[PDB]
A paper describes a structure:
However, we determined the LIG1/nick complex with 3′-8-oxorG:A at the post-catalytic step, indicating the subsequent formation of a phosphodiester bond between the 3′-OH and 5′-PO4 ends of the nick. However, it is important to note that we pre-treated the LIG1EE/AA protein with EDTA during its purification and then crystallized the mutant in complex with nick substrates in the absence of Mg2+. To further explore the ligation efficiency under crystallization conditions, we performed ligation assays in the absence of Mg2+ using LIG1EE/AA mutant that was purified with EDTA pre-treatment. Our results revealed the ligation products only for the nick substrate containing 3′-8-oxorG:A. In addition to our structural observations, these results could explain why the LIG1/3′-8oxorG:A structure is captured at the post-catalytic step when the ligation reaction progresses, with the final formation of a phosphodiester bond between DNA ends at the nick. LIG1EE/AA/3′-8-oxorG:A and LIG1EE/AA/3′-8-oxorG:C structures revealed that 8-oxorG moves 0.9 Å closer to the 5′-end of the nick, which reduces the distance between the DNA ends of 5′-PO4 and 3′-OH to 3.6 Å, and both LIG1 structures share a similar interaction network with the ligase active site residues D570 and R871. Although we observed efficient ligation of nick DNA substrates containing 3′-8-oxorG templating either A or C, the overlay of LIG1EE/AA structures of 3′-8-oxorG:A versus 3′-8-oxorG:C shows significant displacement (0.8 Å) at 3′-8-oxorG toward the 5′-end of the nick in LIG1EE/AA/3′-8-oxorG:C (pre-catalytic) with reference to LIG1EE/AA/3′-8-oxorG:A (post-catalytic) and highlights the differences in the interaction network between the 2′-OH of 3′-8-oxorG and the side chain R871.
LIG1, the main replicative ligase, serves a critical role in the maturation of Okazaki fragments by ligating >50 million nicks during DNA replication and finalizes DNA excision repair pathways by an ultimate ligation step. Furthermore, in line with our previously solved LIG1 structures, we demonstrated that LIG1, which consists of oligonucleotide-binding, DNA-binding, and adenylation domains, completely envelopes the nick.
Residue numbers in the entry: 262 to 386, 395 to 753, 756 to 902
Amino acid sequence: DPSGYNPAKNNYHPVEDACWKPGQKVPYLAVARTFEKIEEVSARLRMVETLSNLLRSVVALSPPDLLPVLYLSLNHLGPPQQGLALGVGDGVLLKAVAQATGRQLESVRAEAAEKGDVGLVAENSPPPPLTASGVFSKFRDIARLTGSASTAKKIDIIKGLFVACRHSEARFIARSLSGRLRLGLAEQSVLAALSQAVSLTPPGQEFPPAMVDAGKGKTAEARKTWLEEQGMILKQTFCEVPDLDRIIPVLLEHGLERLPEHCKLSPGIPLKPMLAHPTRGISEVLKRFEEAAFTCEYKYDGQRAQIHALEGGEVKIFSRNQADNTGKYPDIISRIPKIKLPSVTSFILDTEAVAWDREKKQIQPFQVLTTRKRKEVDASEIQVQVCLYAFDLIYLNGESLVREPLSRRRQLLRENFVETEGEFVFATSLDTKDIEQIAEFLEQSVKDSCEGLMVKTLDVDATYEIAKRSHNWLKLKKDYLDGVTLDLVVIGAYLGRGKRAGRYGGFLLASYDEDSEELQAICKLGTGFSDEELEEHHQSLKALVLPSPRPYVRIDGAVIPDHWLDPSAVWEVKCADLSLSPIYPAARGLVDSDKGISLRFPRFIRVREDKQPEQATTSAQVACLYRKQSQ
DNA sequence: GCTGATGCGTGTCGGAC
DNA sequence: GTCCGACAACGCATCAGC
Ligand SMILES: Nc1ncnc2c1ncn2[C@@H]1O[C@H](COP(=O)(O)O)[C@@H](O)[C@H]1O
């Protein structure tokens, strides 16, 4: 019986402990029961084993449901490049919860805010049982609804789900819709569970499967080593082809050992990009890299563009998160013939697209880039031009370069591609181990409109193998260095969600405007404090809660705090940059008549226990800092 | 026809292991 | 170090209300 389904039990048997009949649809309650057992524990290894048990039963009994169960576990709707999104947030969701439970919407909103979780409100307040594929399909139905009256149609589907929910299902339906499943298990653990499941219980056997536990005859050491090896086969393939729609049919038909024979890196199919680990100083860079020669490059402030040229000439462009951006950049597309030597027949390039001012011939801020339209059919209508800064080459003329060292990938990039100023340029770079030269290069990068340096080894562990290490590169920014900040007043707090439930998750901060003697909201703040500090803030600020705002506190367009606070606490906050804000009033009129100023990537540093609000950073100082950054 | 509100999509940080 | 999920500013696109 699905109500008693226990994928965390000892001696889990994929056949005998499943809670549905062979070949029938996996019930959604089996998924919900699995989620309960996963969120109850903190050790990822234990979460992986529990999910693996569900997956082995899916493989053994009902293999067509493997793909929807995996998406439900990731809370994804499909492969990233297809771009389906629910179009559902707390607004649509709580209205649906309110109507399903028959309660007033304010009562539902208030309880969800206090509890920090929509799932508990949806649950604790005729139709056939939900199935995993049925729920997944309805989720995709919600995402495809568009046009006038689509909100009411989305709500109707959601109410239909809640009406059919049993036991714990409503909790997880609502958390999924809210984007906050909170399992503690995400992409890497799902892949580990999948490789473990298909290794222990191979797909494609006639029911009942003759092989239920392929690890039974191995010592514990041989079992661990084997599962690690199978797990790396799945992880390397997925990093090249992060698309379960392609992988799972192949896995089900040919098994995991033969997977790389059928799914490999190829132009037109986005791959996982290499990411960067933040490093807090040049000395820390030499420590992570030890003896290995490395290169430093400008870290451009734009958007990543993974540019694919297929054999035959089709070009596709993907984002860092593998969204299809091809329709966004008809200007890039028309430029491709200019950037390659005539011998290049296909490639995958790793680049940064940066807004570029063709009148002044210079880079423009990230903010300017974000004003491009999402779709543009005529390059003629484009107003924000872009320059591509190329820094890697992943595939060339039919061959993957993923196992080549950066020294060779970079040489192939420079040898086979053609620069045009203001259109396509190789990232500015420096090969050195001299601490003083690196420090000056870091300074120069900021003067040249970049946010810092990327650092990459050239020959030691210098490949593009994301499954081996996804953060193989280092990012170095001046704002990571100690002593290289603003003192702001806490004027409000926001109730925490999830891991912050039951305390404050965020705070509203303000600068002191000397001329009006008012406090002006400047940004929110929600990271940089330890768990212990955040509880201390909850305890000390609760004494300062007020029913109504003070008349000298101005927040204009900011989110109204859940709790207004008597202005008293002053905190030191660090940011990457200041920005001209559409909503915050701080220093409005000092630089821009209509816009005040906010903080890019603010983080809490420490309490200024001995600073009164009137001695906080002033709005005039905020303006001065913004002007200094703006040349 | 306009607009404000909602949703999606483009970093820093600490905890458990 | 890895994995995960708290939380930031601010843009476009969309849609309900007007
Ligand atoms: N020279 C460069 N090499 C690699 N990434 C770069 C470079 N310049 C800018 N970037 C961007 O920096 C991001 C890496 O930082 P992060 O996303 O913080 O891991 C990439 O996704 C790129 O969009």
